[PDB]
Protein backbone atom coordinates (compact mmCIF):
# COMPACT_ATOMS: atom_id res chain seq x y z
CA UNK A 1 0.00 0.00 0.00
CA UNK A 2 1.65 3.17 -1.31
CA UNK A 3 0.17 6.53 -0.34
CA UNK A 4 -0.06 9.03 -3.23
CA UNK A 5 0.54 12.57 -2.01
CA UNK A 6 -1.07 15.47 -3.88
CA UNK A 7 -3.22 13.12 -6.01
CA UNK A 8 -6.95 13.72 -6.44
CA UNK A 9 -8.86 10.87 -8.11
CA UNK A 10 -12.52 10.79 -9.15
CA UNK A 11 -14.34 7.64 -8.00
CA UNK A 12 -17.76 6.27 -8.94
CA UNK A 13 -18.84 3.17 -7.02
CA UNK A 14 -21.85 2.63 -9.33
CA UNK A 15 -19.61 2.45 -12.43
CA UNK A 16 -17.09 0.12 -10.76
CA UNK A 17 -16.74 -3.05 -12.81
CA UNK A 18 -15.11 -4.86 -9.87
CA UNK A 19 -18.60 -5.54 -8.51
CA UNK A 20 -19.72 -7.12 -11.78
CA UNK A 21 -16.60 -9.29 -11.84
CA UNK A 22 -17.07 -10.31 -8.21
CA UNK A 23 -20.69 -11.20 -8.93
CA UNK A 24 -19.81 -13.32 -11.95
CA UNK A 25 -16.92 -14.97 -10.11
CA UNK A 26 -19.07 -15.90 -7.12
CA UNK A 27 -21.78 -17.32 -9.41
CA UNK A 28 -19.20 -19.37 -11.32
CA UNK A 29 -17.45 -20.57 -8.16
CA UNK A 30 -20.76 -21.55 -6.56
CA UNK A 31 -21.88 -23.47 -9.65
CA UNK A 32 -18.53 -25.25 -9.97
CA UNK A 33 -18.63 -26.23 -6.29
CA UNK A 34 -22.21 -27.50 -6.54
CA UNK A 35 -21.83 -29.40 -9.84
CA UNK A 36 -19.75 -32.42 -8.61
CA UNK A 37 -22.24 -33.34 -5.88
CA UNK A 38 -25.11 -35.72 -5.18
CA UNK A 39 -28.24 -35.09 -7.23
CA UNK A 40 -31.63 -35.53 -5.55
CA UNK A 41 -33.52 -36.42 -8.75
CA UNK A 42 -34.66 -39.78 -7.27
CA UNK A 43 -36.22 -37.92 -4.31
CA UNK A 44 -38.80 -36.04 -6.41
CA UNK A 45 -41.57 -38.39 -5.32
CA UNK A 46 -44.85 -38.01 -3.49
CA UNK A 47 -44.66 -37.85 0.30
CA UNK A 48 -47.17 -38.77 3.01
CA UNK A 49 -46.84 -35.92 5.51
CA UNK A 50 -48.46 -35.67 8.92
CA UNK A 51 -48.10 -33.39 11.92
CA UNK A 52 -45.08 -33.55 14.21
CA UNK A 53 -45.90 -35.40 17.43
CA UNK A 54 -43.48 -33.45 19.65
CA UNK A 55 -44.44 -30.45 21.80
CA UNK A 56 -45.08 -27.65 19.28
CA UNK A 57 -45.32 -24.06 20.46
CA UNK A 58 -48.02 -21.70 19.21
CA UNK A 59 -45.76 -20.15 16.56
CA UNK A 60 -44.38 -23.44 15.17
CA UNK A 61 -47.76 -25.03 14.37
CA UNK A 62 -47.72 -26.04 10.71
CA UNK A 63 -44.04 -25.16 10.20
CA UNK A 64 -42.76 -28.76 10.38
CA UNK A 65 -44.16 -31.95 8.88
CA UNK A 66 -43.21 -35.58 9.48
CA UNK A 67 -43.08 -36.92 5.94
CA UNK A 68 -42.53 -40.44 4.66
CA UNK A 69 -41.34 -41.29 1.17
CA UNK A 70 -40.10 -44.44 -0.43
CA UNK A 71 -36.71 -43.85 -2.02
CA UNK A 72 -33.94 -45.70 -3.86
CA UNK A 73 -31.06 -47.83 -2.62
CA UNK A 74 -27.52 -48.63 -3.73
CA UNK A 75 -28.98 -51.46 -5.83
CA UNK A 76 -31.47 -50.79 -8.61
CA UNK A 77 -33.96 -53.62 -7.95
CA UNK A 78 -34.88 -52.58 -4.37
CA UNK A 79 -36.25 -49.56 -2.54
CA UNK A 80 -36.65 -48.38 1.07
CA UNK A 81 -38.76 -46.17 3.36
CA UNK A 82 -37.32 -42.89 4.67
CA UNK A 83 -39.18 -41.03 7.40
CA UNK A 84 -37.88 -37.47 7.61
CA UNK A 85 -38.80 -34.13 9.14
CA UNK A 86 -39.30 -31.30 6.61
CA UNK A 87 -40.07 -27.62 6.93
CA UNK A 88 -43.39 -26.54 5.44
CA UNK A 89 -41.51 -24.11 3.17
CA UNK A 90 -39.63 -27.03 1.56
CA UNK A 91 -42.74 -28.97 0.45
CA UNK A 92 -45.85 -28.04 -1.54
CA UNK A 93 -49.29 -29.74 -1.59
CA UNK A 94 -49.98 -31.97 -4.59
CA UNK A 95 -53.13 -33.39 -6.13
CA UNK A 96 -53.29 -37.08 -5.26
CA UNK A 97 -55.19 -39.58 -3.13
CA UNK A 98 -52.21 -41.44 -1.63
CA UNK A 99 -49.46 -38.83 -1.18
CA UNK A 100 -49.87 -35.30 0.18
CA UNK A 101 -46.80 -33.22 -0.73
CA UNK A 102 -43.89 -32.87 -3.13
CA UNK A 103 -40.51 -31.29 -2.61
CA UNK A 104 -40.58 -27.68 -3.77
CA UNK B 1 -57.20 -40.23 -38.90
CA UNK B 2 -56.99 -36.96 -40.86
CA UNK B 3 -57.41 -36.63 -44.64
CA UNK B 4 -54.23 -37.57 -46.54
CA UNK B 5 -53.34 -38.18 -50.17
CA UNK B 6 -52.06 -41.41 -51.69
CA UNK B 7 -48.45 -40.19 -51.74
CA UNK B 8 -48.41 -39.74 -47.93
CA UNK B 9 -49.97 -43.08 -46.97
CA UNK B 10 -47.88 -44.48 -44.13
CA UNK B 11 -45.65 -41.39 -43.96
CA UNK B 12 -47.06 -40.09 -40.65
CA UNK B 13 -48.07 -42.31 -37.72
CA UNK B 14 -50.06 -41.65 -34.54
CA UNK B 15 -47.99 -43.28 -31.78
CA UNK B 16 -48.96 -43.65 -28.11
CA UNK B 17 -46.52 -44.42 -25.31
CA UNK B 18 -45.96 -44.19 -21.55
CA UNK B 19 -43.69 -41.23 -20.76
CA UNK B 20 -42.18 -40.26 -17.43
CA UNK B 21 -43.13 -37.16 -15.43
CA UNK B 22 -41.38 -34.89 -12.95
CA UNK B 23 -42.27 -37.52 -10.35
CA UNK B 24 -40.19 -40.67 -10.49
CA UNK B 25 -43.07 -43.06 -9.67
CA UNK B 26 -45.86 -41.56 -11.80
CA UNK B 27 -46.00 -42.25 -15.54
CA UNK B 28 -48.28 -40.58 -18.10
CA UNK B 29 -49.94 -41.90 -21.24
CA UNK B 30 -49.08 -39.71 -24.24
CA UNK B 31 -49.97 -39.65 -27.94
CA UNK B 32 -47.76 -37.96 -30.53
CA UNK B 33 -47.53 -37.86 -34.31
CA UNK B 34 -44.20 -39.03 -35.74
CA UNK B 35 -42.85 -39.18 -39.25
CA UNK B 36 -42.33 -42.74 -40.47
CA UNK B 37 -38.64 -42.02 -41.08
CA UNK B 38 -38.18 -41.32 -37.35
CA UNK B 39 -39.46 -44.74 -36.20
CA UNK B 40 -38.44 -48.34 -36.88
CA UNK B 41 -40.63 -51.49 -36.67
CA UNK B 42 -40.24 -53.44 -33.44
CA UNK B 43 -42.64 -56.30 -32.75
CA UNK B 44 -43.97 -56.87 -29.24
CA UNK B 45 -47.29 -57.80 -27.66
CA UNK B 46 -48.33 -54.16 -27.09
CA UNK B 47 -45.90 -52.13 -29.26
CA UNK B 48 -45.18 -51.79 -32.98
CA UNK B 49 -42.34 -49.27 -33.36
CA UNK B 50 -39.48 -47.61 -31.51
CA UNK B 51 -37.44 -44.49 -32.20
CA UNK B 52 -34.84 -45.09 -34.91
Amino acid at each position, epitope marked *: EIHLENVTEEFNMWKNNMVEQMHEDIISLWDQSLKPCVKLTPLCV*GLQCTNVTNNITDDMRGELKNCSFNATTELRNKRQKVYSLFYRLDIVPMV*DL*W*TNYRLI | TNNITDDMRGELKNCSFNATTELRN*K*RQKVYSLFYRLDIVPMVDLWTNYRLI
Partner: antibody, heavy 129, light 106 residues
Protein backbone atom coordinates in the same frame (compact mmCIF):
# COMPACT_ATOMS: atom_id res chain seq x y z
CA UNK C 1 -64.75 -58.29 -10.66
CA UNK C 2 -66.02 -60.40 -7.75
CA UNK C 3 -66.04 -58.80 -4.28
CA UNK C 4 -67.33 -61.07 -1.50
CA UNK C 5 -67.84 -59.49 1.91
CA UNK C 6 -67.37 -61.20 5.28
CA UNK C 7 -68.43 -59.99 8.73
CA UNK C 8 -71.92 -58.59 9.37
CA UNK C 9 -72.34 -58.59 13.17
CA UNK C 10 -73.85 -55.68 15.12
CA UNK C 11 -72.07 -55.49 18.48
CA UNK C 12 -72.64 -53.93 21.89
CA UNK C 13 -70.93 -50.71 23.08
CA UNK C 14 -67.19 -51.08 23.62
CA UNK C 15 -66.82 -53.53 20.72
CA UNK C 16 -64.39 -53.41 17.82
CA UNK C 17 -64.65 -55.31 14.53
CA UNK C 18 -62.55 -56.57 11.65
CA UNK C 19 -64.33 -56.90 8.30
CA UNK C 20 -62.91 -58.52 5.16
CA UNK C 21 -63.43 -58.09 1.42
CA UNK C 22 -62.31 -61.09 -0.63
CA UNK C 23 -61.54 -60.20 -4.24
CA UNK C 24 -61.18 -62.19 -7.45
CA UNK C 25 -61.49 -61.83 -11.20
CA UNK C 26 -58.78 -59.17 -11.64
CA UNK C 27 -55.13 -58.56 -10.83
CA UNK C 28 -55.48 -57.96 -7.10
CA UNK C 29 -52.12 -56.32 -6.41
CA UNK C 30 -52.49 -53.34 -8.81
CA UNK C 31 -56.05 -52.08 -8.11
CA UNK C 32 -57.08 -49.88 -5.20
CA UNK C 33 -59.66 -51.11 -2.69
CA UNK C 34 -61.64 -48.47 -0.77
CA UNK C 35 -64.23 -48.50 2.01
CA UNK C 36 -67.47 -46.49 2.12
CA UNK C 37 -69.85 -46.18 5.08
CA UNK C 38 -73.58 -45.97 4.31
CA UNK C 39 -74.45 -44.25 7.65
CA UNK C 40 -77.81 -45.09 9.34
CA UNK C 41 -80.13 -43.74 6.66
CA UNK C 42 -77.82 -40.83 5.78
CA UNK C 43 -75.50 -40.14 2.88
CA UNK C 44 -72.24 -41.86 2.09
CA UNK C 45 -69.01 -41.19 3.99
CA UNK C 46 -65.55 -42.10 2.71
CA UNK C 47 -63.47 -44.18 5.14
CA UNK C 48 -60.19 -44.80 3.31
CA UNK C 49 -58.49 -47.21 0.98
CA UNK C 50 -55.38 -49.17 0.14
CA UNK C 51 -53.21 -50.27 -2.78
CA UNK C 52 -52.40 -53.95 -1.90
CA UNK C 53 -48.88 -54.24 -3.39
CA UNK C 54 -47.46 -51.00 -2.01
CA UNK C 55 -49.71 -50.94 1.03
CA UNK C 56 -50.44 -47.21 1.28
CA UNK C 57 -53.49 -45.64 2.94
CA UNK C 58 -55.21 -42.26 3.03
CA UNK C 59 -57.63 -42.44 5.99
CA UNK C 60 -60.08 -39.55 6.10
CA UNK C 61 -59.81 -36.79 8.68
CA UNK C 62 -62.57 -38.15 10.93
CA UNK C 63 -61.27 -41.75 10.78
CA UNK C 64 -57.56 -40.86 10.92
CA UNK C 65 -57.11 -42.65 14.28
CA UNK C 66 -59.81 -45.36 14.27
CA UNK C 67 -59.88 -47.25 10.97
CA UNK C 68 -56.99 -49.58 10.03
CA UNK C 69 -57.27 -50.82 6.43
CA UNK C 70 -54.80 -53.58 5.49
CA UNK C 71 -54.47 -56.02 2.60
CA UNK C 72 -53.12 -59.53 2.01
CA UNK C 73 -51.82 -60.12 -1.53
CA UNK C 74 -51.19 -63.83 -0.91
CA UNK C 75 -54.88 -64.55 -0.23
CA UNK C 76 -56.11 -61.52 -2.26
CA UNK C 77 -58.19 -60.24 0.66
CA UNK C 78 -58.60 -56.68 1.94
CA UNK C 79 -59.28 -56.09 5.63
CA UNK C 80 -60.60 -53.15 7.65
CA UNK C 81 -60.31 -52.93 11.45
CA UNK C 82 -62.74 -50.57 13.21
CA UNK C 83 -61.82 -49.73 16.80
CA UNK C 84 -64.01 -47.93 19.35
CA UNK C 85 -67.23 -48.02 17.33
CA UNK C 86 -69.44 -48.31 20.45
CA UNK C 87 -73.08 -48.06 19.23
CA UNK C 88 -72.64 -44.94 17.10
CA UNK C 89 -72.78 -44.81 13.31
CA UNK C 90 -74.32 -48.24 12.86
CA UNK C 91 -74.23 -48.69 9.10
CA UNK C 92 -73.77 -50.91 6.09
CA UNK C 93 -70.08 -50.94 5.14
CA UNK C 94 -69.17 -51.33 1.46
CA UNK C 95 -66.00 -52.44 -0.32
CA UNK C 96 -65.21 -50.82 -3.69
CA UNK C 97 -62.63 -51.38 -6.43
CA UNK C 98 -60.74 -48.87 -8.51
CA UNK C 99 -61.84 -48.16 -12.06
CA UNK C 100 -58.37 -48.83 -13.41
CA UNK C 101 -54.94 -49.67 -12.06
CA UNK C 102 -53.50 -47.10 -9.68
CA UNK C 103 -49.95 -48.44 -9.90
CA UNK C 104 -48.81 -50.36 -13.00
CA UNK C 105 -45.91 -52.78 -12.70
CA UNK C 106 -44.36 -53.45 -16.10
CA UNK C 107 -42.30 -56.32 -14.63
CA UNK C 108 -40.87 -56.91 -11.15
CA UNK C 109 -42.36 -54.42 -8.59
CA UNK C 110 -41.60 -51.04 -10.23
CA UNK C 111 -45.10 -49.84 -9.32
CA UNK C 112 -45.39 -46.43 -11.16
CA UNK C 113 -48.64 -44.58 -10.29
CA UNK C 114 -51.15 -43.69 -13.05
CA UNK C 115 -53.07 -40.68 -11.58
CA UNK C 116 -56.46 -42.43 -11.44
CA UNK C 117 -58.90 -40.61 -9.12
CA UNK C 118 -61.98 -42.75 -9.89
CA UNK C 119 -61.37 -45.29 -7.11
CA UNK C 120 -65.11 -46.19 -6.77
CA UNK C 121 -66.09 -48.80 -9.40
CA UNK C 122 -67.29 -52.48 -9.13
CA UNK C 123 -69.06 -51.38 -5.97
CA UNK C 124 -69.55 -54.63 -4.10
CA UNK C 125 -72.35 -55.48 -1.73
CA UNK C 126 -72.24 -54.37 1.90
CA UNK C 127 -72.39 -55.77 5.43
CA UNK C 128 -74.58 -54.31 8.18
CA UNK C 129 -72.53 -53.62 11.33
CA UNK D 1 -70.85 -30.80 -0.62
CA UNK D 2 -74.65 -30.61 -0.72
CA UNK D 3 -77.49 -31.32 -3.14
CA UNK D 4 -81.32 -31.16 -3.21
CA UNK D 5 -82.93 -33.92 -1.19
CA UNK D 6 -85.55 -34.96 -3.75
CA UNK D 7 -86.82 -34.37 -7.29
CA UNK D 8 -89.92 -35.81 -9.00
CA UNK D 9 -90.98 -34.66 -12.49
CA UNK D 10 -93.04 -37.47 -14.10
CA UNK D 11 -92.59 -40.70 -16.09
CA UNK D 12 -91.39 -39.95 -19.61
CA UNK D 13 -90.20 -36.42 -18.74
CA UNK D 14 -86.44 -35.91 -18.77
CA UNK D 15 -85.20 -34.87 -15.31
CA UNK D 16 -82.15 -32.80 -14.37
CA UNK D 17 -80.50 -32.27 -11.02
CA UNK D 18 -77.29 -30.90 -9.56
CA UNK D 19 -74.88 -30.71 -6.63
CA UNK D 20 -73.04 -27.60 -5.46
CA UNK D 21 -69.93 -26.73 -3.51
CA UNK D 22 -66.85 -24.54 -3.53
CA UNK D 23 -63.83 -24.31 -5.84
CA UNK D 24 -61.86 -26.91 -3.87
CA UNK D 25 -64.57 -29.60 -4.27
CA UNK D 26 -66.20 -29.15 -7.70
CA UNK D 27 -64.77 -26.05 -9.40
CA UNK D 28 -61.24 -27.31 -10.00
CA UNK D 29 -59.74 -30.77 -10.52
CA UNK D 30 -62.53 -31.91 -12.90
CA UNK D 31 -63.18 -35.12 -10.88
CA UNK D 32 -66.92 -35.17 -10.11
CA UNK D 33 -68.62 -38.57 -9.85
CA UNK D 34 -72.28 -39.55 -9.59
CA UNK D 35 -73.78 -42.80 -8.28
CA UNK D 36 -77.24 -44.39 -8.63
CA UNK D 37 -78.10 -46.42 -5.51
CA UNK D 38 -81.26 -48.48 -5.71
CA UNK D 39 -82.59 -49.62 -2.32
CA UNK D 40 -81.01 -52.69 -0.73
CA UNK D 41 -78.13 -52.79 -3.22
CA UNK D 42 -74.73 -51.27 -3.91
CA UNK D 43 -74.47 -47.87 -5.66
CA UNK D 44 -73.70 -48.17 -9.37
CA UNK D 45 -71.09 -45.86 -10.91
CA UNK D 46 -72.73 -43.81 -13.70
CA UNK D 47 -70.91 -40.66 -14.87
CA UNK D 48 -67.17 -41.44 -14.12
CA UNK D 49 -65.61 -37.92 -14.09
CA UNK D 50 -67.54 -35.14 -15.91
CA UNK D 51 -69.53 -36.46 -18.91
CA UNK D 52 -68.25 -40.08 -19.18
CA UNK D 53 -69.82 -43.55 -18.57
CA UNK D 54 -68.88 -47.11 -17.43
CA UNK D 55 -70.24 -49.28 -20.26
CA UNK D 56 -73.61 -50.99 -19.74
CA UNK D 57 -75.42 -47.71 -18.90
CA UNK D 58 -78.48 -47.04 -21.05
CA UNK D 59 -78.75 -43.63 -22.76
CA UNK D 60 -75.37 -42.56 -21.29
CA UNK D 61 -76.71 -40.50 -18.33
CA UNK D 62 -74.39 -37.78 -19.64
CA UNK D 63 -73.78 -34.85 -17.30
CA UNK D 64 -72.13 -31.43 -17.26
CA UNK D 65 -70.31 -29.01 -14.97
CA UNK D 66 -70.35 -25.21 -14.77
CA UNK D 67 -68.75 -22.97 -12.17
CA UNK D 68 -68.82 -24.83 -8.87
CA UNK D 69 -72.05 -26.72 -9.72
CA UNK D 70 -72.19 -30.13 -11.40
CA UNK D 71 -75.36 -31.60 -12.85
CA UNK D 72 -76.78 -34.48 -14.84
CA UNK D 73 -79.72 -34.96 -17.21
CA UNK D 74 -81.67 -38.23 -17.32
CA UNK D 75 -83.22 -38.42 -20.79
CA UNK D 76 -86.11 -40.79 -21.36
CA UNK D 77 -86.85 -41.23 -17.65
CA UNK D 78 -88.34 -44.64 -16.81
CA UNK D 79 -89.71 -46.31 -13.70
CA UNK D 80 -86.37 -48.13 -13.24
CA UNK D 81 -84.69 -44.83 -12.24
CA UNK D 82 -86.45 -44.64 -8.84
CA UNK D 83 -83.14 -44.49 -7.00
CA UNK D 84 -81.02 -42.32 -4.71
CA UNK D 85 -78.60 -40.24 -6.80
CA UNK D 86 -75.41 -39.30 -4.95
CA UNK D 87 -72.86 -36.63 -5.84
CA UNK D 88 -69.22 -37.20 -4.89
CA UNK D 89 -65.97 -35.43 -5.65
CA UNK D 90 -62.31 -35.04 -4.86
CA UNK D 91 -61.92 -32.48 -2.07
CA UNK D 92 -58.76 -30.77 -0.89
CA UNK D 93 -56.57 -32.22 1.85
CA UNK D 94 -56.49 -35.25 -0.49
CA UNK D 95 -59.91 -36.65 0.42
CA UNK D 96 -63.19 -37.71 -1.15
CA UNK D 97 -66.57 -36.25 -0.22
CA UNK D 98 -70.16 -37.30 -0.89
CA UNK D 99 -73.43 -35.40 -1.01
CA UNK D 100 -76.57 -36.20 0.91
CA UNK D 101 -78.30 -38.06 -1.92
CA UNK D 102 -81.10 -36.95 -4.24
CA UNK D 103 -84.24 -39.10 -4.18
CA UNK D 104 -85.76 -39.43 -7.65
CA UNK D 105 -89.42 -40.48 -7.39
CA UNK D 106 -90.23 -40.42 -11.14
Amino acid sequence: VQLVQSGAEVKKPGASVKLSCKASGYTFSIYAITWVRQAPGQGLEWMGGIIPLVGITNYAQKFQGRVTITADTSTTTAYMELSSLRSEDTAVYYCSRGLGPSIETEDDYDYSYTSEYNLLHVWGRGVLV
Amino acid sequence: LTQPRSVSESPGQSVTFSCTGTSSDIGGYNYVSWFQQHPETAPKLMIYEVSKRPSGVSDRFSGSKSGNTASLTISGLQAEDEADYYCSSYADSNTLVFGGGTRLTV
